[PDB]
Design a binder for these strands. Structure first.
Ligand SMILES: [Mg+2]
Ligand SMILES: [Mg+2]
Ligand SMILES: [Mg+2]
Ligand SMILES: [Mg+2]
Ligand SMILES: [Mg+2]
Ligand SMILES: [Mg+2]
Ligand SMILES: [Mg+2]
Ligand SMILES: [Mg+2]
Ligand SMILES: [Mg+2]
Ligand SMILES: [Mg+2]
Ligand SMILES: [Mg+2]
Ligand SMILES: [Mg+2]
Ligand SMILES: [Mg+2]
Ligand SMILES: [Mg+2]
Ligand SMILES: [Mg+2]
Lengths: 394, 199, 153
RNA sequence: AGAUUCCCACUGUCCCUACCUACUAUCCAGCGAAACCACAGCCAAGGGAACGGGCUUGGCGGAAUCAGCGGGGAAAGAAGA
């Protein structure tokens, strides 16, 4: 007969292959649309999650109760060291899709990138791809280079560029680096290629890619949680107490006459470690690293206009499971995808953002230092000393 | 030893009624440009005739369901697979002789293509009726590649205008040396007229 | 006695055979298929690294419910296990065969095993006790073994 | 230790689900069974002893396997009480 009482469906069929993702690093599927109007510029960027903290700002929106009141918000911290360009790669336009055409590397590839291509760096004799780097010092090579580049002048339509991250500047355990392709949008191919030819074997920081409080998208891989059931997975109800063969189940699987089982019934498997793509996270602040000038180091990162203390964005006793921050950082809004020490892929916005809340300009007032590692009750070191006093340990 | 075919102006059932016999009789056929084919009947009836085929998916796991191809090639290959015994080793060893392309690839542009007259819209339709294209149909039903095909079918028409100009340029030179010489080939034509070659 | 497969030249071949051994039959079949073409100083190193869980023995046929291992990715197969008795009771056989390959007066350390064969055996009988006063049998499964070495340089 | 209804105190029965622990299951060394089985195992419609795992017309199909799972096999039990 019919179901007596109506109900909405549990879960979504849009994400149904809930499997362990075949890639750990995030993968950009959809780059933004170019036009020959604007000058050339990159689109995506690659960073590393560290932790979370408060913020306290003022709100400027007319037509609400919160106008001109000091609200608080919750942010993340994403450490973004400068990236290195190690090669270009073109693409052609076909009716069967979009075939790749030609790839041209640089002369002195660092050993951080010589790693990724290997598995067992200790046992290998480190023949680190040194016939191709005979093609940047001999005059039999710069012909085929000038004809490769004139081929990508003529026959190429989209030019992505090969960049790898920089691992010497991180407190992580590993020593291997992440390569990635990033698409350059701009004018014609002649301009785009003469721009990127110059940047070859260089550092590219964040601020020559982004700006401030532009709405961006975050592509990353979920925290993983093992082989969970169907209550923890699809979030259904539990059966009552008087049952016999368990109670965290789903009772009626399918109907009779469809002799199969439908593919939309909630079954038990893997949970987490998936690919996901969040949209419209807004940036509040782009800090700067520990730079040493005139002997000592200057670390007034978190010095706002109103606190104007010299404290940085490292809390007391370091971030948990990450370490300390010496490089720069972006400061997002809301939670993001991925556990700690997880690599994360940023991207500018697909959408023509024109509303009243994505045009709001942002002023901070007070960045917290909450040593989660225990309840916080201080902000920095010396105030804790000028408040407790002298100790027996001294 | 290998046939070629155009796809403009030919019908869909009449072409596949010639081709599913000529394949089984041992003859490699390649049919190029299968987006200029047109279908009998008006447009919106063949679109509701096709979206009532797109609504038919196997219910419990559609990945096992009817693979709805959307290209005009894998539609013409669909409506040949129906005219063949595709369960047996004399069907599966015939479909690997047929080869269908969207647009026209470079291996088959510098070759003279043959044209079937028995399947043309101007012959097999009264001229007061309606016909419907297939390309604009596939674009309306989910084909993403007309903005590439239209310009790759523009760069070869521009290459063949040039090849027709240098075909005319050698032909005029041929008819002027054939005007200068015929003093000395006056005798090698009074032997051809009486055998019927230059009338 | 008369073995199944006749050797090529009994000058170069040493023989051995064990009757009515108490092991399983299937474990011993498979670990007596991984060994067929090796050298004797490799086989006596393998059958120890089977004991100490270094190299594994892949179950190809009798694989019901047998879990997988990573070390069997050498043999290009997923399901392996590390059986102990079936590697002891045909190592004490390669000491019998080596001593008779010395008594006949051949060269020991160039023997290539060419033939090994395991048969079924007469089943023993015990009994066990189930519900409602029923009795189910609890039989074993021993095996026969015979093998032919050969010097192949 | 009988059957019905109402109010006080108390409560994870419930809104609405979470977390910890023990022995199990899971993988390994050892020992090691039975119930059952014509041949075997992907689906829609049609006819048909009027609801097929096989025939017909179509859709389609790629070894060998592990942990789960209860829709089906008009499942197993017992010559319908
Ligand atoms: Mg409903
Ligand atoms: Mg009960
Ligand atoms: Mg804490
Ligand atoms: Mg902590
Ligand atoms: Mg088997
Ligand atoms: Mg018992
Ligand atoms: Mg008893
Ligand atoms: Mg065991
Ligand atoms: Mg019937
Ligand atoms: Mg049946
Ligand atoms: Mg049959
Ligand atoms: Mg069932
Ligand atoms: Mg039943
Ligand atoms: Mg009866
Ligand atoms: Mg009776």
């Amino acid at each position: 007969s019919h179901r007596k009482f109506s109900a909405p469906r549990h879960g979504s069929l849009g994400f149904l292959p809930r499997k362990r993702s075949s890639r750990h690093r995030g993968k950009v599927k959809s780059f933004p649309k170019d036009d020959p109007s604007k000058p050339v510029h990159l689109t995506a960027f690659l960073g590393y999650k560290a932790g979370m903290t408060h913020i306290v700002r003022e709100v400027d929106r007319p037509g609400s109760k919160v106008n001109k009141k000091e609200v608080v918000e919750a942010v993340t911290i994403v450490e973004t060291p400068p990236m290195v360009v190690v090669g270009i790669v073109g693409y052609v336009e076909t009716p069967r899709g979009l075939r790749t055409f030609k790839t041209v590397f640089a002369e002195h590839i660092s050993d951080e990138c010589k790693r990724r291509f290997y598995k067992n760096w200790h046992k290998s004799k480190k023949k680190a791809f040194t016939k191709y780097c005979k093609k940047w010092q001999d005059d039999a090579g710069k012909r085929q280079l000038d004809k490769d580049f004139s081929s990508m002048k003529k026959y190429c339509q989209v030019i992505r560029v090969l960049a790898h991250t920089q691992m010497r500047l991180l407190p992580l355990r590993q020593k291997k680096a992440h390569l990635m392709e990033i698409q350059v949008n701009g004018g014609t191919v002649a301009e785009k290629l003469d721009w990127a030819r110059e940047r070859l074997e260089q550092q590219v920081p964040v601020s020559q890619v982004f700006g401030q409080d532009e709405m961006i998208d975050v592509i990353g891989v979920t925290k993983g949680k093992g082989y969970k059931g169907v209550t923890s997975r699809w979030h259904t109800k539990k059966l009552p107490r008087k049952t016999h063969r368990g109670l965290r189940k789903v009772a009626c699987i399918g109907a009779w006459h469809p002799a199969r089982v439908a593919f939309s019934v909630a079954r038990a498997g893997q949970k987490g470690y998936h690919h996901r793509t969040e949209i419209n996270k807004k940036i509040y602040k782009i800090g700067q690293g520990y730079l040493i000038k005139d002997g000592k180091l200057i670390k007034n990162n978190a010095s706002t206009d109103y606190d104007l203390s010299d404290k940085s964005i490292n809390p007391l006793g370091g971030f948990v499971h990450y370490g300390e921050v010496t490089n720069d950082f972006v400061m997002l809004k809301g939670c993001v995808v991925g556990t700690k020490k997880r690599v994360l892929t940023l991207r500018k916005s697909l959408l023509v953002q024109t509303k009243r809340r994505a045009l709001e300009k942002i002023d901070l007032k007070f960045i917290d230092t909450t040593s989660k590692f225990g309840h916080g009750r201080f902000q920095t070191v010396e105030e804790k000393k000028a408040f407790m006093g002298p100790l027996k340990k001294d | 030893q290998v046939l070629v075919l155009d796809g403009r102006g030919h019908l869909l059932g009449r072409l596949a009624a010639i081709v599913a016999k000529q394949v089984l009789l041992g003859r490699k056929v390649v049919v190029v440009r299968c987006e200029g084919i047109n279908i009998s009947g008006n447009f919106y009836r063949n679109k509701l005739k096709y979206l009532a085929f797109l609504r038919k998916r196997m219910n419990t796991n559609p990945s096992r369901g009817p693979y709805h191809f959307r290209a005009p090639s894998r539609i013409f290959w669909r409506t040949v697979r129906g005219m063949l015994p595709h369960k047996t080793k004399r069907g599966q060893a015939a479909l690997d002789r047929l080869k269908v392309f969207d647009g026209i690839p470079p291996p088959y542009d510098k070759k003279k293509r043959m044209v079937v007259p028995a399947a043309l819209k101007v012959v097999r339709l009264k001229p007061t009726r309606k016909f419907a294209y297939l390309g604009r149909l596939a674009h309306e039903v989910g084909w993403k590649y007309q903005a590439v095909t239209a310009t790759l079918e523009e760069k070869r028409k521009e290459k063949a205008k040039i090849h027709y100009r240098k075909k005319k340029q050698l032909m005029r030179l041929r008819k002027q040396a054939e005007k200068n010489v015929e003093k000395k080939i006056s005798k090698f034509t009074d032997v051809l007229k009486t055998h019927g070659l230059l009338v | 006695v008369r073995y199944s497969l006749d050797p090529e030249n009994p000058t170069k071949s040493c023989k051995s055979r064990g009757s009515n051994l108490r092991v399983h039959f299937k474990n011993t079949r498979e670990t007596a298929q991984a060994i067929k073409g090796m050298h004797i100083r490799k086989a006596t190193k393998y059958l120890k690294d089977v004991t100490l869980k270094k190299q594994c023995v892949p179950f190809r046929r009798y694989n019901g419910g047998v879990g997988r291992c990573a070390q069997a990715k050498q043999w290009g197969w997923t399901q392996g296990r590390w059986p102990k008795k079936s590697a002891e009771f045909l190592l004490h056989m390669l000491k019998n065969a080596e001593s008779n390959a010395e008594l006949k007066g051949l060269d020991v350390d160039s023997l290539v095993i060419e033939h090994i064969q395991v048969n079924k055996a007469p089943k023993m009988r015990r009994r066990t006790y189930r519900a409602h006063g029923r009795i189910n049998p609890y039989m074993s499964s021993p095996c026969h073994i015979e093998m032919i070495l050969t010097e192949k340089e």
